[model samples]
Target chain A: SVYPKALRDEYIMSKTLGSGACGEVKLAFERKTCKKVAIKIISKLNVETEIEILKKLNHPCIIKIKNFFDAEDYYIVLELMEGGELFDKVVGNKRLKEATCKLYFYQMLLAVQYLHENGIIHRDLKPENVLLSSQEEDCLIKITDFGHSKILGETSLMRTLCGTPTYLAPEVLVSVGTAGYNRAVDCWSLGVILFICLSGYPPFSEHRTQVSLKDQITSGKYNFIPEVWAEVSEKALDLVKKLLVVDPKARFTTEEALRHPWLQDEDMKRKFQDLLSEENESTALP
Target chain B: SVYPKALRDEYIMSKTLGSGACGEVKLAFERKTCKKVAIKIISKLNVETEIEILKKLNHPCIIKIKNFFDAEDYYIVLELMEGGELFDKVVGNKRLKEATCKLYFYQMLLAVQYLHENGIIHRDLKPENVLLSSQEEDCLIKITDFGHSKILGETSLMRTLCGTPTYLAPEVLVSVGTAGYNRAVDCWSLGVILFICLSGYPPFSEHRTQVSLKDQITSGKYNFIPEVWAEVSEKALDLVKKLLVVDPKARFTTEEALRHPWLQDEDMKRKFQDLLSEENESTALP
Candidate 1:
């Protein structure tokens, strides 16, 4: 049904920000409040999963969905952020500096920590999902898209094969039907991201759909030339190796990773101290 | 060090099946003429990526790497079948009967189960990697490709953004560089496979790569035609929907999936019976 005349839209539709498989993502302003909101229109079924997952979780790092309405289709009213997607930055600038990468990595770690604490697993963690706050790599990383997320601890093991091909853990690729997969696979993707941060491209990229997903999951296949990684610290590489550890048992858990040397950097500590001091000063001033 | 000529080849090479970023897979004969084997050649750099997982796993539904040798390069051999890949069949025939689809799906379930049980997650599961034992749809289903597998339950969420964009889970597409992707991601890929099985095309297909991947994962947009899929039972659609559950955690676990009516179907039962009957008749003929 159409909206009543009083509540009907009077503002013009602005330029498109993006488009999904189902519909367009547009940035529009409310003429009344002068509020600019990003409106994402999705089919009913497509947003159902997101709604289910989102309604159940609360986290500082998660991108918040403000409101949802139905017109010809479902509409998701989201909290507007000032930045474009990180992909644009990646393609435009080629790559970020080591310190900048570390900042984003730290934010990602914090976000994942929040999800784990809530028993929610973001099953698909990639760069495209990350939209910057305003072209600032160090901006607070707000994790988005719960479409691949699932609540953990409900099943002893999960066996449904999902995820992007190159970043898959070994077990999910090898197992067929009798057993199930646990949550450690996410760590492998983290490792791949770390590798990309250090090396630019993925360690297991062939650019072919027909390539072997199995061969890529085994450990020690990566060939890294020190020249390409001249600026990357040894500690960072170690952190990636620890996360990508092929053995699920040996792979880092949330607790173990928190203590990883990569997260224990002196530079990071200084930044944390600054954040802490700022918080303290703000509280005191208030 | 290079081995002597006589000692070099642990398994004789017959023919090359394919090659990719990881290495080359070749058809070879072992022990006797009927003992056909598949040999995968990995560069020294790629061997470490999957070796540990391969060493720990054994399952009928999953492909087995029979032998491993390091001579200048790396060589991994596996049991070979006469029939071609499921991908070739799908591409050639466009689609398959429900019975054949059931057989392949059953094997996939079994393989997925075994991997998940061992805490291994196969992030990249697709038809191209699924090999068939015979031309019949009821023939043995062997899922190959472990290059992208990883053991789950490891610490620290994975944040790597890799995969054929087409098969990527929405969460992975959106949260490109965050960690905490867990086991449910695999189930999302299974949903894609199921869609392809039923519709003869990927649900989020477009002529462009970036556009298609984006649409499929982020938008939750699938081609749903009530008329064309009218013949496809609601049970089948339900099963597809269940696997494709955007929320990975909500997706059916391996054992749960096996118990689903879709897997425990009259068509699958009938196909298994036919397979057994055919096996007996072939023995009598021989």
Candidate 2:
């Protein structure tokens, strides 16, 4: 019926940061340590699943929970993230430099690597869930908002019909019964985001505004319009094509993506050299 | 360069929610509206003016911002608040009855009255920014964040660093030069959060193991302590007294606090019945 006195007296409150589907987060000032924090207020029973998952996570790219009070209600105090979301930065700027996208993509990959290693599937790895630690160019990418995240047991295949339709892998949308998915779903979403990063648009579109974007996703058909493709690196394009494969089994896993040529310094340099030579040859012929 | 076509084509971005010192927010939605809706992203140069003033709003209760986006780097999305704050429901549970505080005082007269009038000075009200739009509870307290919020005009009496330091009043500390404040000081942090929602232990404390909490807040002098105030009625305690009063004129601007029955009803009721019985002696001691 009430928050415990010991916990209530711990922190001074501020204002609302934002609200979500299940709860709301507020800016708070911790009394004992004198730190500004974000307090997430959620239903006690409903939030246990999330808390259990959060307590198990330990990564620089993941949101950290400073303290929590389990009263009649759930009072979770998280480290405040002043930097905004990844979606905003990418979409706001439209297109990003290959180097800039690599920075964010590298960190994001490491975060996903950590998550999968811990037997977790961040089923929802869309841009909105990715947050920046600050406003600097070198700001750290901290993946947050694990509302739709799940834990996968050995040999488990999650069949939930969740996640944003635009980012959902084909396997996740199969209507033929309990056909589940694995961590590969996150990889697909990551691929979609990468495609958006280099090009200034998503790989798939909502055709005619009537057809579901899922149809486009399931078809695995998208193109790098020549205009946008002209400047994109071959290695980067190759990496995205590999990940966006229709078959989940054929798609690149986080480990594979991390090792792709575009993500490797030496490999990317060689690709750049070859591209330069090809351009010279074409110019000489003309 | 501006945002690219590919990234822009992914979502139909829209409106500004609220901005911060470094970022400004704009709303957006996925191509498929069902699966996803609402995105917030912030920007620079084009957004500073909006952010500068977002910090200065004051109200009885209000959670500002439906969405915020940072376009240069990330897209942040915000939504409406529904769940209430931990402070109000928690500490308020200690001394207030559901009907009395909820029906009358819960409206938080000071916040609404001040907001409705001019020179709004929320000056950082706390508690998860006080939300209320849940499916349950006919809730109504909504106040929110104002990161370095400022007022308009050339001659506004606003100076001196304020906010988030253990319910501070002006007397606790002042500056070398002018740097004075005004009614916006929020009446000594609402009398230290109504003395911790009618006393479960607040108004300052310092354990032997720790340094003097008093040093940080010298104007911490206050009373209405235990035993003496144990039986204090509506008017005697709840109404704003000399609570850390540095300047009498600076406290309780609105006359509403003295007018509320929860604040004055019992006192008036007692006085009225006393007079009523005085005329009858009545039916004596029924």
Candidate 3:
């Protein structure tokens, strides 16, 4: 049995955006319209769930999964992101300014809010999983990795333990046997990403071999080293604290995070609306 | 023209259970069955909303409003609670044992969850508003005050800032201008109540003259005071920390509180079910 090789004829592929264990993302352009796209070539296991979850998600902040090519390896065509990973952007400086950090954080919140509203949880929500529209300092950010994402049913929980370390919610560690976690797990990781985005390092880490990183996290032990956070506003710290709470039930939801006083600004709100509108009008090749 | 003397003929009123700003609660007995009840006679500025709210609520842990008498004042009849207030119970001991504290807390969560599920918010949830079924230490607890309660519609918020000072969520104080609050206010109070039940004192207080209590609350300032909390379980402390979060969205919901590890015990779960059964069989006058 042979699969159609139509993808090779329709688009010209070049440049690797990123590569994972079994797949690689390549930059490509449509043959006719010449529109740029990010084509993810993945060799997968248990992929039906991913395809089902991917098809329905359509939002400004979430990466759209356009047409796919089925072969020995599957081609997942996505909205091409030129600005590179948020990780690189944050790595460029010691950390992001509170204003810049908040601007990007707001978009992530909006994206995650959309995911959660559709019963999706982007379990791995680190800076690396987020991508920028371009290299500009104030360009739009999009959440890129739905590889570890899951579609949670109404009133149900995700029992499968899968997430990046330092970003794991306490419930995931504590509920090892039976008790599962809900969308709140993603909120806790967002907090970690938030802390790193603002402070340049994660709140919890294995810096010392003597100190147990697991205990530090499960016990909800993290300090705001005054020197590191002195310049940061209290509102920002307030959000971090709420999101990093040990109790998943008490962690901030994406919607609540979006509404936090830190994210409520006329310019930021206006910026978000404009970015959304820009995305809305992105119907034709540009 | 005159109102009917129907209440006097139907039931015999006796001792005053308690009295408040405008009215007093009296112990009464129905003539035919001699079933004891608590009759709250209130002179109110707004009576229609209270009556409408009172008519539809029925739950085991919630004090039932059986019937009402309308005249110059309103005599709202409720199920008689022989065991008095939880404030009295908590005052007797330095603080309740973790076992006892959780027993009461679980019931409170259930009652509050029922209120929330019914679109009601017990705006004033405090120890004094909770009543026990009997003077026994293990007697069933029932939430007694809906006087300051309001029925929130789908997707609406409460702008009115009305709650006890020590129990108020930061949003109520910070959003004094407009943004408003949701059911989370009651959850915050539950946390305050939980803290007091565990350590015999409210987290924030006006004990110090120079320190602003409002600032203390809005800033989310409180401490473990090791000597007092030394005997308390980390699980108990964990729940407290989550609830007392300054961010209302981060505060524990009634459902989330019930699912907390501190409240998840087989015996306690069984006890709750048994109590509900006892309430279920409270079909006839005893």
Candidate 4:
């Protein structure tokens, strides 16, 4: 009966925010500060690891965790994001606009870049894991759902068979017996997400392909329907190509993907160069 | 000559993001991580005040400052927001959609709440001060330009006359030689922004009224054109009414604005209640 006394003392749990693979999320407000949070009730395995990483992270695009309590049920308190999952947005809008897709993808890259720099790999990176801050068209994007996330630590490769079916990297499947997979698995998932978001359909959905989903993904046989992707930029296609490589070593690194031409704002960069000259002039007197 | 050597060691300056009254902003990436930042070259005035508050803040909705340098010119490094000012978005769109306006307004309330909680008042709470994370419809909102910001630290009210003329709370001008104003000044600015965003025109622009702009704001003489206001929810207009009141004591507090019915997501709340019932069933013994 004393199990969750600390949780009660700190948070006033109210409505349920949502539910997912790991637990049921309830809306809560801090007793003293009244800041909103989603307190996830973990019924089963490993709350500590996710809490470990969540507490360690501090990025604008990453889902923030407030604190956690380990009682009868693990209460993984997190920052409440009102915008809902990216899954519904894509499904509702069919295909996001080019600027919209790139905007979301750029933020995703930043988060991943941060994670990778810290030696963590998000095994599950999908529309369902990515959340918007609000329902507004200009809401912020945050990456959440880190149940399958792993800290690469000293060993660069992980043999764990994890992540969603459609988003599973080719190396994850092929290396089940031996060498294992690395951070590139996340890159592969990012590529799949990019493909699905831009096309409004999963790459290996077996829609008209009728081909084996596993075979289709492993072979990197995804194609952009002309009608759906005609207006999309070639530079975007180039980035996707680099990300979806069958060989993990050849896939685009987070650094490379970020520098891709599609992500650069042309006018801003030009103005920056011109003004860079102005700033240099000011300090040149030294 | 030794000045700013540390800035160069840590960041690689590339592009100029923009310029403003306080300084020119240039885009730079962290040398080790390649994370982008806007290095504001502040030429005149004390930089430590802004840096002090910036270092203390960690809210997602508030603009983040990375680091600052005290060179011949102050290089105030900041998190780069790819999306431009809310001012241009409002001007370009004329009238933001109902959901869009509510989304931006809610985030503004959150930022203000965080600032006020920490004894800071963003006196300049205008569209120009609020920036989006990117050019996409779902970008994140951040409050910036702390030149006019003040640390209300211990002091409940401030006597300084700051902030843009159009969004200034009436009390700021009315209390010129009297008792000062509190955090409610930011609340009044939020009201003006809400009114202008929803109607696609400022409530006190003096375009048609021919009344003195200062007089219109001080007396709270403003209206919503029927054609523009008709489609917007009555609750939203009510919030604006409450916020733009003449008496600073009567204006809506950030806490009150956040809980206002206009900002509530109807379906989400209903679903939250439904799931709350389900979650309670799981913990029945209590």
Candidate 5:
């Protein structure tokens, strides 16, 4: 089917990068400017809901929305980041230096703050969505994918039953139970992301099946590894605790998450390029 | 939107049972026949494909498909199940008796054998997809939802990037990282299911964002929880080990899995009802 409004000739489709429940992301080149772009083809149903949230979002740390065009499936043309997903790199090597972890978390905090400021909640915040622009000196941190993202107003609570099971918040896991669940889940997902980044594992995990969504959420069980606590600074652990808080109301909002000491560490900020360089070197060796 | 060809008068629409990536299933009734049915409204694209696979699958352990109809979406009327999802029941209590776990596993194995015999592989096998028929005596296990199920002939290496992320096999995770994978992934899901039944938690999971799919598939980081291991019988552990083997080729096949001494014990067979009754009583209290 032809894209309703987006001109195919305007953008030269290069190669297919990946796809998911949301839709597909294509590597493309702008015909006029020869600029490389990652064109995300999202379903109309999702686009209608997402555009409302996406339009207001702005952050240097977040993946910038270059432009978008509507069709049966809306084409969300975004800046293409050459570096791989954080999840891939983290998995290859089980741990990261304190300085390196700080860089990524700081960027994530900035991105989160931007979304929260715009009243947008990224419910599916995870490492796969976190990317680097390129393995270079001036490389940028980019957060992408807003399919499961939602908008929240002051004093408004969301109650949609969505998101990957493991990262679900306790409120959602509980109140939603056999019946269904809602939005505070995004914070819980963020908590899981933080834990994974620091510990290289989830707080609640089993080898076979994932921990039961109901048990974890309704019961609100989150205990960090002492090993991780010792290795990571108290501030980082504090952030993890705040995000993973069982009480959504008490959970760290984007404003609070961004203001943490990890985000403001000057010495840590200077070492990021070196960290990326080291990561690039190791990544290249294998 | 109107559900096409739905027998509204005959079928009283009960509450929505569950929903997923494909479509929805409602607990409905056939007034003329004076019987209840699980009205599975599936996408038409899957009608021919599903019919080919469902028709060949015949086992007492499997959910029976009474009839098929089509309108806007294809409808497959299944045996109405009442006990909700297996996960819901599992979460009600800390753990089920070894016997109860064995019965469910045995039934699952039998169903798996039937499918494998028919050359079908249930790519997405998790507790959510396993339903119980009516909340009554003798909780008969019925495998539901074949949306991700596929037909895999001998010597075929499949590469459809499907299956619930948490229940994914190490090989599938490796496949997600690199190239293709095979049917052994199903056994991995089974292993995770076993862990959940015994420990009331899933085996593998971290934050969806924090843990890369590649790390998950490659890590096979099944934490050998001492408490869990100490309580579960040696036979059970052996069974888990067999299915969770990192090498997909070396992992237990359907035939091999069924023959495990742990699953064939007569003692485990006789104790099924009592365990469910015990679980039911405890579950009700919760």
Candidate 6:
């Protein structure tokens, strides 16, 4: 059987990029432009809402939607990211450089800041959901997966038990059926991502399955393996500590995190400036 | 006068992003998502075709369109690039390091490859069209401007005298009103960009007049001033010389340039790797 007219006429479907909770994303080539894109075929109760949320998001670090075709099958064409997942990179490499981590974290924070500023909560923001644009030397980290995204307001509080267990904020776990939580839930996840980036493993590991990973996350308790943690910069650990706070109100917001000394290290800034000056002098012709 | 309904209800226009041949792009806040977006308000005369082209192209290095609203007036919402133009950076800072230039050029080449593979020739690829995601230390260079973009077939050759003069290839100028040139035109522009990155001046100068600039470009004869060019790596200049060839066939294709020793310098690559390793070792249990 032929695919939908829109997909059939414009796109040539290829292998699957990945699978998600709602559906799998397949790689497809646009016939006219000859561009490869990842098309998400979701069959949720409210695919339209996801589409609406995607439409509203426009940041460099966020995955962008090129076009959407709604019919018996809901299709969303996304920019194909070849760099794979942030989770895969961190897992495979064990961890990355603080400078490199800071480089990526800066972009990640900007994306979340844009999201929160617009009053939208990325109910799920995990490394697995974060995609790298390329696996090459110059790769960009893009946050994807809006399956559980919600439009929030200043006074709004979300009660949905959304997001992965390991990344869930304390409030989100306790608010299962009680007082709703705000965008801080995403901040908590960002903290977890930051931790994993510094040390090769998640703070609340699933391997420790005997005890609930959820319990450890909600308790805001996780040992910093000195072997690994000792090497991590104090500023980084400080930022992570602030983000992993059990109190949602006390958690570091995206804006605050962007301003963290770890993210805005003077040493890193000086290195960048020094490089710039060295290049400038080399070209000055004087 | 009020903005169009499609834009008014959905977006709150702030300031103008840019004014181009097609139309003006405005900085606006997306109401539902509360995010800032750059909206291009193009005339309907040929907006449909542009929209179709924009829909097909998707790459991290390329600017993205979130949504297109077709009405009496055509509006295309794009990811806001606040870092401004690549031209400004070079002009402001004179030049960037070989490492920094490679960092950007790699992504730029990948973007062009994606464009060329998709049968789209960005007839206009210049520093002005290149935008940075942020002006901060951690920035991603994004290629913008589809105003002069074209969809080419296997045997197609573009025949328009489009694009800024200094960056245009010889074939593009010589083929002015003829059968036209192929995707190599963009590669020529890439060469010009690399040159400027190494030495904060275009290979062909518009010092005298437009005629003089065109003459110099078509001649494919420009010097690597010993004072300035002395510092630029031999491999980089080698690639530049290959790209600035008068003949389109002789000019370095995007794929070939991507593999150029200059573009794929192991020293730069090793530097990046060393940085990663150094950071890893620093974080390792000592």
Which stretches of candidate 2 lie above 4 Å from their native place?
A: A1-7, A43-45, A70-73, A154-181, A207-211, A266-286, B1-286
Taken in order, the candidates have interface RMSDs of: 17.2, 26.6, 19.3, 28.4, 18.6, 27.8
For candidate 1, the per-residue lDDT at A210 reads 56
How would you encode candidate 4's per-residue C-alpha lDDT over A125-219 as one tens digit per residue?
88888988767655568898777677766431231222221111122233344342467778888888888778787765556766655556656
lDDT of 2 by residue, B112-194 (tens): 45553555545444343444433334344555444323343333113212222111111212221323334424545555555
Q: Which ten residues in a row have the lowest lDDT in candidate 3 chain B?
A: B159-168
- Among incorrect, acceptable, medium and high, the docking class of model 5 is incorrect
Cα lDDT of model 1 by residue, A170-193, tens digit: 233333332323455566666666
Docking class of 3: incorrect
| Candidate 3: stretches off by over 4 Å | A1-286, B1-4, B154-181, B280-286
True A-B contacts kept by model 3: 0.00
Clash pairs detected, candidate 6: A33-B118, A34-B118, A118-B34
How does residue B45 of candidate 2 score in lDDT?
A: 16
lDDT of 6 by residue, A47-135 (tens): 77777787878776788888888866788998888877887778763888777788778778988999988878775677888888777
Give lDDT: candidate 6, residue B283.
50
All models, RMSD in angstroms: 25.0, 29.2, 17.7, 33.2, 17.9, 31.2
Give stretches of model 4 more than 4 Å off.
A1-286, B1-3, B153-181, B266-286
Better of 3 and 5 by lDDT: 3
Candidate number that wins on TM-score, 3 or 6: 3
Report the lDDT tens digits of candidate 3 across residue range B1-286.
Answer: 3223788888888889987766788998989889988888877315656777766787778877778777888888878888888888667446878888888898889889999999887766788888988877776899876756777663212312222221112222333442434678788778888888999876776655465555556666664478888999999999988887766666788888888899888897787787667766545776
| Residues B131-190 of candidate 4: C-alpha lDDT, one tens digit per residue | 887776655688987765767643212312222111122222333443434577788888
The digit string of per-residue lDDT tens for model 5 on B19-138 reads: 755678887777887777788777641566676677667775666677677676777777777776787767754677777788888878878878776767776678887887657534
DockQ per model, Cα: 0.02, 0.01, 0.01, 0.01, 0.02, 0.01
- TM-score attained by chain A of model 2: 0.75
Best by lDDT: 3
Tens-digit lDDT string for candidate 3 (A61-136)? 7777777887787888877788888888666447988888988998889888888888787766777788888776
